C-alpha cells in the first residue's frame, strides 16, 4: 500500500516563501530517489527537483535553480521542497513521484493580488 501524502502549498506572494512536505509509507523509502513535479495551468507536468537514496545526488530544473532546496529525512520517510523568492510562474499542483507512484497534489499559488 504505497502512499504519498503531500502538505505545505499555500497562497503567497511574489518573493514570499513555502515549504512542502511528503510524507511516504508502504515501500522502502530510503532506497529510492523522490522526486517533485509540478503542473501549472495550460502546461504540461514538469519535472522540479529530484534526490537521490542517500541525498547526495540532486536535480533542479533550470527555472528553480538557486531558489529552491530539495531534502529528505529518511528517519521520518520524508522529501521536503523549501522554495524561496517564488513568482507567479511556480504557481501549479505540485506533486510528489516515486517508482511510478504519485502524490494528490498540493496547491502553490503565488499572486501579489492587489
Known amino acids: 500500500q504505497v502512499q504519498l501524502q503531500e502538505s505545505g502549498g499555500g497562497l503567497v506572494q511574489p518573493g514570499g516563501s513555502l515549504k512542502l512536505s511528503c510524507a511516504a509509507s508502504?515501500?522502502?523509502?530510503?532506497?529510492?530517489?523522490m522526486s517533485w513535479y509540478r503542473q501549472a495551468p495550460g502546461k504540461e507536468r514538469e519535472s522540479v527537483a529530484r534526490?537521490?537514496?542517500?541525498?547526495?545526488?540532486?536535480y533542479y530544473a533550470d527555472s528553480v535553480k538557486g531558489r529552491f532546496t530539495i531534502s529528505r529525512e529518511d528517519a521520518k520517510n520524508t522529501v521536503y521542497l523549501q522554495m524561496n523568492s517564488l513568482k507567479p510562474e511556480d504557481t501549479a499542483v505540485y506533486y510528489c513521484?516515486?517508482?511510478?507512484?504519485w502524490g494528490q497534489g498540493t496547491q502553490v499559488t503565488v499572486s501579489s493580488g492587489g
Open positions: 513521484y516515486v517508482g511510478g507512484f
Open positions: 508502504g515501500f522502502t523509502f530510503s532506497r529510492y530517489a
Open positions: 534526490i537521490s537514496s542517500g541525498g547526495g545526488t540532486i
